[PDB]
């Protein structure tokens, strides 16, 4: 029974670590794209004027 119950304790840590790494990598790309999205259009309009 203690073998049976220790099957919903935690996953093999490798996949959790991989998910953590993937999300951490994606966050920085999101940040950079947000920065350039802020920068581009208003400055383009100001160049027009």
């Amino acid at each position: 029974l203690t073998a049976a119950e220790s099957r919903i304790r935690d996953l093999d840590i490798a996949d959790e670590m991989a998910k953590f790494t993937k999300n951490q990598i994606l966050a920085q790309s999101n940040i950079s794209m947000l920065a350039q999205a802020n920068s581009l259009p208003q400055m383009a309009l100001s160049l027009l004027g």
């Binding site: 994606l26 790309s29 947000l34």
Partner: protein
Amino acid sequence: AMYINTNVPSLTAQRYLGETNNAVSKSLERLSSGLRINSASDDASGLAI
């Protein structure tokens, strides 16, 4: 021939600028999202699969 209020090249430039801005917006959305299809209109057959 020199006229007044015949700025056709301005209209042409405005049109081309409009299409360029639309393309920039779509590319930024795609790369920020990190997905190919998104929405429901990019591909009509991949969604069900």
